[PDB]
């Protein structure tokens, strides 16, 4: 019951600036582990 007409010209998808620089530059290798915990080790390496 409305006789007015309309036309859509353009639509834009706003977004915020997001670039993962820190995990791009430094964290380069991925290790999927199926176990429960994860171990990392450090060896002193000071020999007289």
């Amino acid at each position: 019951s409305m006789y007015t007409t309309a036309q859509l010209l353009a639509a834009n998808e706003q977004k915020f600036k997001f670039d993962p620089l820190f995990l791009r530059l430094f964290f380069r290798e991925s290790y999927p582990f199926t176990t429960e915990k994860v171990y990392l080790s450090q060896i002193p390496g000071l020999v007289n």
Partner: protein, 53 residues
């Protein structure tokens, strides 16, 4: 575990071959093939265990 993945097109734009893939499918859609051991992998291992025991 692998750490770098590279893309290699199968065929060059000129029509020459750049990557070769060979296998025999059985069903309609099969992306990658399966070895011939699936029928007897289990019996082989159990035979090995029986022999050693």
């Amino acid at each position: 575990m692998p750490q770098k993945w590279t893309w290699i097109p199968r065929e060059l734009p000129g029509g020459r071959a750049s990557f070769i893939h060979v296998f025999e499918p059985v069903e309609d859609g099969q992306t990658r093939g399966a070895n011939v051991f699936y029928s007897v992998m289990e019996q082989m291992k159990m035979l090995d265990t029986l022999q050693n025991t």
